[PDB]
């Protein structure tokens, strides 16, 4: 009657923020085989489901998300296990008697060295052709890593091509997707929806420029953890993607040297053709419209009438000062001083960048591991969409005058924050009690 009674309810729409173990999904594309193990991954539902939670307002937070911290390690653990059964090149740390490449600042070295054959007696006087950045002299040269860490050559049957990974949550959990067209990753979300799996994001690991990502809606989106703090990177997302074309015009040769029983190191043979360096092209017309479109969104945070300047990287390492990424199998390191050479106030071919290549790349954020990128045969040429920008701000003491922006970002989590800004993990608790004038039997 007037005295209500407790009544248990099962299957109530109640959730709280939590963290758990997310799993994968990767379509059913026919195939083979790559680094990011799309193999033992669960296929994607052919007809995905998305339920728009009407009237629901939820507070998201892209900077304190766990999917980013979880995907960051999954990719590292993916690259780790993929290199485990592959060749180890400890016999390659031998004195390299090098010389300039055959041409007419060399950027290449024709190095000869002794090498262990299949037998444990006679040696092998075989030559190779390593890049300038993968070899350092000593008073003759040596592989750059040898004083720092051991090396492991990637098997040439695995592919470095990123294919989409769908992150999902197990039973009892759900992932929420904020679907408003103007959202800076933090704060309450007006229009929210639930999904079991995120959309297919490709684990592209780039720097300065963010490639093959998703596009923002309407206006270009700007996201930062603390705009007033110049020690935090500012992630940018484009509405219209700029076209970028990279190529390595060097028809290389793959010399298959045999080291010991079974193992086989792949060297660089004689180059067929001209000695042309790698580069990337960006249309001057599109980049002039995109940079002017981002600075219009920057004035909404630093006064309406202010001056914004762009400059290249200052202090930094190699894999951060240069637009570092993978394009066809080789690892390019492109000079971005031609893209951030601008100065905007309050109100016809392409742009080429001198790219350099490394075969010995070091593990990001760890002490003693480096891998050998096997040489690719053929003139490499990839086409990509630059859809984002990792930018930093120089903390000038004379503030509120003119602000300068410089790129960077040698941390993979920013490459994952760029596509996990619209997702967060919650746990469903279906046990809910409620009062009503309902009593059971005697």
């Amino acid at each position: 009657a007037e005295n209500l009674w407790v009544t248990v309810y099962y299957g109530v729409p109640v959730w709280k923020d939590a963290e758990t173990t997310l799993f994968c999904a990767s379509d059913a594309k026919a195939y083979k085989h790559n680094v990011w193990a799309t193999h033992a991954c669960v296929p994607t539902d052919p007809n995905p489901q998305e339920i728009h939670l009407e009237n629901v307002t939820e507070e998201f937070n892209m900077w304190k998300n766990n999917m980013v911290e979880q995907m960051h390690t999954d990719i590292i653990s993916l690259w780790d296990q993929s290199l485990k059964p592959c060749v180890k090149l400890t016999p390659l740390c031998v004195t390299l008697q090098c010389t300039n490449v055959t041409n007419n600042r060399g950027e290449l070295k024709n190095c000869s060295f002794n090498m262990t054959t299949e037998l444990r007696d006679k040696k092998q006087k075989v030559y190779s052709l390593f890049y300038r950045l993968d070899v350092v002299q000593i008073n003759e040269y040596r592989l750059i890593n040898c004083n720092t860490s051991a090396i492991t050559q990637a098997c040439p049957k695995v592919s470095f091509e990123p294919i989409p990974i769908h992150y999902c949550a197990p039973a009892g959990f759900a992932i929420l997707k904020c679907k408003d067209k103007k959202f800076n990753g933090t704060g309450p979300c007006p229009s929210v929806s639930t999904v079991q799996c995120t959309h297919g994001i490709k684990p592209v690991v780039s720097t300065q420029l963010l490639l093959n990502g998703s596009l923002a809606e309407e206006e270009v989106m700007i996201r930062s953890e603390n705009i007033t703090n110049n020690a935090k990177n500012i992630l940018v997302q484009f509405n219209t993607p700029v076209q970028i074309n990279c190529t390595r015009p060097n028809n290389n040769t793959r010399k298959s040297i045999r080291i010991g029983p079974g193992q086989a190191f792949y060297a660089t043979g004689d180059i067929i053709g001209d000695i042309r360096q790698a580069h990337c092209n960006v249309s001057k017309a599109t980049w002039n419209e995109t940079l002017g479109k981002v600075v219009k969104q920057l004035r909404k945070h630093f006064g309406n009438n202010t001056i914004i300047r762009f400059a290249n990287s200052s202090g930094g390492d190699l894999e951060v000062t240069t637009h570092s990424f993978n394009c066809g199998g080789e690892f390019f390191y492109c000079n971005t001083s031609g893209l951030f050479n601008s100065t905007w106030i309050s109100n016809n071919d392409s742009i080429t960048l001198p790219c350099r290549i490394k075969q010995i790349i070091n593990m990001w954020q760890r002490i003693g591991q480096a891998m050998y990128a096997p040489p690719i045969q053929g003139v490499i040429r990839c086409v990509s969409n630059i859809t984002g920008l990792i930018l930093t701000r120089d903390g000038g003491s004379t503030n509120s005058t003119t602000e300068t922006f410089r790129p960077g970002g040698g941390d993979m989590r920013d490459n994952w924050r760029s596509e996990l800004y619209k997702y967060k993990v919650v746990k469903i608790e279906p046990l809910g009690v409620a009062p009503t004038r309902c009593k059971r039997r005697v």
Epitope: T102, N103, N104, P249, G273, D274, I275, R276, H279, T352
Partner: antibody, heavy 132, light 106 residues
């Protein structure tokens, strides 16, 4: 028409200095490039070096420290010098105009090209014998 | 080196080493007792006064020697043929390649 004529001594003692002259008729010595070519008997021709105004002059790396070219704009003729001659310098020295070219293979901006030359209008040629 | 071709046929002449990069081969013809003349500059580009019967191998092939093709062979073409190799991988050649004399038979 362009008529080039070489004229020199034709006989130079060993360890001396050769002095040749290419009398130009048909065009100016300033608005064109000039090159000298020698050829021993029964051998292939050998390039000696090109000469042009504004100090654009290069020498043969094998004959660098001995040859000295010049252009006489007031007299409209090409000159040549060769100090310290030996028996291997006995050849037929020619005089020819030179037209430059630019062969592009890369991306132009990265200096991925090279400048090639070719002589189109030769001369009648002079004969120079080295003996004591 | 001597190569002979029956009159009216097509002639082939090899000069210089094998190509290491993009080339711009210059061909010359030396009449016996006369001065050498320019035949084909820039691999396969003929100036004014040279018929289309002469064609050189393109300098876009990587791994082949400089080939000089002479269609419709006549007794007047019996002379020496030298080449000037301009290679992007090799330094400037100040000595012409060893020539090849064309012999008109019949």
């Amino acid at each position: 028409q362009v008529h080039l004529q070489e004229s020199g001594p034709g006989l130079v003692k060993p360890s001396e200095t050769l002095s040749l002259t290419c009398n130009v008729s048909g065009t100016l010595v300033r608005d064109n490039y000039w090159s000298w070519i020698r050829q021993p008997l029964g051998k292939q021709p050998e390039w000696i070096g090109y000469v042009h105004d504004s100090g654009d002059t290069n020498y043969n790396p094998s004959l660098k420290s001995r040859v000295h070219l010049s252009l006489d704009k007031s007299k409209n003729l090409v000159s040549l010098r060769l100090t310290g001659v030996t028996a291997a310098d006995s050849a037929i020295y020619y005089c020819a105009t030179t037209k430059h070219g630019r062969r592009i293979y890369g991306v132009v901006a990265f200096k991925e090209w090279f400048t090639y030359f070719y002589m189109d209008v030769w001369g009648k040629g002079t004969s120079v014998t080295v003996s004591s | 080196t001597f190569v002979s071709v029956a009159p009216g046929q097509t002639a082939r002449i090899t000069c210089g080493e094998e190509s290491l990069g993009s080339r711009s081969v210059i061909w010359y013809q030396q009449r016996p007792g006369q001065a050498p003349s320019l035949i084909i500059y820039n691999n396969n580009d003929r100036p004014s006064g040279i018929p289309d019967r002469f064609s050189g191998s393109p300098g876009s092939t990587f791994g082949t020697t400089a080939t000089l093709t002479i269609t419709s062979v006549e007794a007047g073409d019996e002379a020496d043929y030298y080449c000037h190799i301009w290679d992007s991988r090799r330094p400037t050649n100040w000595v012409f390649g060893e020539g090849t004399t064309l012999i008109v038979l019949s």
